[PDB]
C-alpha cells in the first residue's frame, strides 16, 4: 500500500491541476477570436500563451519545484512547456471527431484549424496519434497529473544546472506513479511502461514543434501575432 | 489658387487615409474583447497595435517618405506614432458624450475605460481637451490628412539623421496646408496658426503617455498584455 508522503504528493498534484485547469474553457472568450494566410494563428497563440500561464501555476505547486533555483525553474519550463501543454490538452481531445472540443463550434479545434496556425502535417500527424494513444490509456487523474509533473521534472533538458537534484525529484514522482498504479489501478500491469513511452513521444513532438516555431518566429509578420510570453518561453535567450 | 504639385500631394494623402482608416470599425471584432486591475488593457493594446499598422500604411504613402532611409523612417515612426494615433482618433470622438464611439456599447471608449488601461488622469485631462479642441476646429479632410503628415514629418524627434531633408518635406506640406486653407476654406484666416498650435499640444501629450507607458512596460504582468508591435514601437531600442 501507499505511504503518507506518497499520497501527500498525490493530493498536492491533483489539487494544483484542479486550480490551473478549467473544464468549462470559460476564459476562451477573452482570446482573440478564431477565424477560418494563418487566420487561426492569433487565437491559437492566445490559447498557448494562456496555457503557459496555467502550466507555471501547476509547476509552482509541484513539491520541490519552488526550492529549485530560479534559473533551473526557467530552464525546466522553457524546455517542457509545449509537452505539458500537449499533455493537458488530452483532457479536451475527443475520439469521436479527432479534435479538441473546448466548447461549441468556435472552440472546436480540428485538423484544418491547426494548419491555419502555420503548422504543417509533420507535426500534426504524430501529435494526433499521440493524443488518441494517450486517450486510450484511460488514465486516472492521479496518473495524468503525475505524468505532467514527471515530464516537467526531466533533467535531460538544455539549460539545467542541478540535474542531480531534479533527477532526484523526478525519480520519486515515478515511485509515486508506480506505487499508485499497483495499489490502486486494476489491470495496469503494463500501464507504467506505456506512460513512460509517452514521455519519449513528447520529446519527438517537442522537437518537431520548436522546429516549425523557429520558422514562424523568424517571419516578423507572423511573430507579431504571438504574445510576449510565447516569445519569451519559446525564444532562444 | 493651388498648383498641380500641391493638389497631387493632397490627392495622395486623402487617398492614403481612405485606404488606412475604416469608418465602420469592423476589425475591432478581431481584438481581444473589452472588459469593464487593468481589465481594458488587452483590448486597448490591441487597438493601439492595430492603429500603428494603419499609421505605417499611411506613412508609406506620404510623398517623399518612402525615399528616406529605413532608419529615418523608423526614427520618425517611433517618435510620432502616438501623436498620429491621437490625431486620427479624433475622427471617432463625439462631443455629445466626450468619448470615442467606434460602435455600439462595446467599442464606445469613455473616460473610465481609458483608466482601466493603466493610464492616469494626468494623461486623460489634456488629451480630452485636445480632442474637443480639435473637434471644434471642424477640419476638412485635406487639413486633417495634412496635419497628420505634417506631424509625422517633424524633424524635431530623437533618432533622426537627415533632419534637413525631412524638414524640407515638412516645410512643404505646410505650404500645401497654408495654400489649401486660403484658397478653399472660407472663414479660416486663423485656422493654420491654430492647427500648428495643436502640434505643440501633441508633443506634450506624447511625453505624458510615454511616461506612463514606461511604467507599464516595466511591470511584466502588464507588459505581457501588450503586443510585440507595441513593445517594438514604444520600446527603447
Amino acid at each position: 500500500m501507499l505511504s503518507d508522503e506518497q499520497m501527500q504528493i498525490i493530493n498536492s498534484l491533483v489539487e494544483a491541476h484542479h486550480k490551473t485547469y478549467d473544464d468549462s474553457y470559460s476564459d476562451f472568450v477573452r482570446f482573440r477570436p478564431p477565424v477560418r494566410r494563418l487566420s487561426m494563428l492569433p487565437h491559437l497563440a492566445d490559447l498557448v500563451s494562456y496555457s503557459i500561464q496555467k502550466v507555471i501555476g501547476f509547476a509552482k505547486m509541484i513539491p520541490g519545484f519552488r526550492d529549485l533555483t530560479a534559473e533551473d525553474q526557467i530552464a525546466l519550463l522553457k524546455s517542457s512547456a509545449i509537452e505539458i501543454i500537449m499533455l493537458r490538452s488530452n483532457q479536451s481531445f475527443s475520439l469521436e471527431d479527432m479534435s479538441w472540443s473546448c466548447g461549441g463550434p468556435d472552440f472546436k479545434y480540428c485538423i484544418n484549424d491547426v494548419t491555419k496556425a502555420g503548422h504543417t502535417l509533420e507535426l500534426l500527424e504524430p501529435l494526433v496519434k499521440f493524443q488518441v494513444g494517450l486517450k486510450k490509456l484511460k488514465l486516472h487523474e492521479e496518473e495524468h497529473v503525475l505524468l505532467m509533473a514527471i515530464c516537467l521534472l526531466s533533467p535531460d533538458r538544455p539549460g539545467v544546472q542541478d540535474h542531480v537534484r531534479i533527477e532526484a525529484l523526478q525519480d520519486r514522482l515515478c515511485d509515486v506513479l508506480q506505487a499508485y498504479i499497483r495499489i490502486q489501478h486494476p489491470g495496469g500491469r503494463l500501464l507504467y511502461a506505456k506512460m513512460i513511452q509517452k514521455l519519449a513521444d513528447l520529446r519527438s513532438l517537442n522537437e518537431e514543434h520548436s522546429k516549425q516555431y523557429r520558422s514562424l518566429s523568424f517571419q516578423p509578420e507572423h511573430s507579431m501575432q504571438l504574445t510576449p510570453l510565447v516569445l519569451e518561453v519559446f525564444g532562444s535567450e | 489658387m493651388l498648383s498641380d504639385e500641391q493638389m497631387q500631394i493632397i490627392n495622395s494623402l486623402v487617398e492614403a487615409h481612405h485606404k488606412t482608416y475604416d469608418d465602420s470599425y469592423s476589425d475591432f471584432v478581431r481584438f481581444r474583447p473589452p472588459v469593464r486591475r487593468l481589465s481594458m488593457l488587452p483590448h486597448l493594446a490591441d487597438l493601439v497595435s492595430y492603429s500603428i499598422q494603419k499609421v505605417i500604411g499611411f506613412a508609406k504613402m506620404i510623398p517623399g517618405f518612402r525615399d528616406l532611409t529605413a532608419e529615418d523612417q523608423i526614427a520618425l515612426l517611433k517618435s510620432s506614432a502616438i501623436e498620429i494615433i491621437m490625431l486620427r482618433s479624433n475622427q471617432s470622438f463625439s462631443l455629445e458624450d466626450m468619448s470615442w464611439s467606434c460602435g455600439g456599447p462595446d467599442f464606445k471608449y469613455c473616460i473610465n475605460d481609458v483608466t482601466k488601461a493603466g493610464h492616469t488622469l494626468e494623461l486623460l485631462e489634456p488629451l480630452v481637451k485636445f480632442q474637443v479642441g480639435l473637434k471644434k476646429l471642424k477640419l476638412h479632410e485635406e487639413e486633417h490628412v495634412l496635419l497628420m503628415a505634417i506631424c509625422l514629418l517633424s524633424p524635431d524627434r530623437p533618432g533622426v539623421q537627415d533632419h534637413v531633408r525631412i524638414e524640407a518635406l515638412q516645410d512643404r506640406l505646410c505650404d500645401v496646408l497654408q495654400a489649401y486653407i486660403r484658397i478653399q476654406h472660407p472663414g479660416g484666416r486663423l485656422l493654420y496658426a491654430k492647427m500648428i498650435q495643436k502640434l505643440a499640444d501633441l508633443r506634450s501629450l506624447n511625453e505624458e503617455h510615454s511616461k506612463q507607458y514606461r511604467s507599464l512596460s516595466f511591470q511584466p504582468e502588464h507588459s505581457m498584455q501588450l503586443t510585440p508591435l507595441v513593445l517594438e514601437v514604444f520600446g527603447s531600442e
Binding site: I56, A70, E237 | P220
Partner: peptide, 9 residues
C-alpha cells in the same frame, strides 16, 4: 525571462 521570473513570483 523576466515575465517568467515574475510569474514564478
Amino acid at each position: 525571462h523576466k515575465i517568467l521570473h515574475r510569474l514564478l513570483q
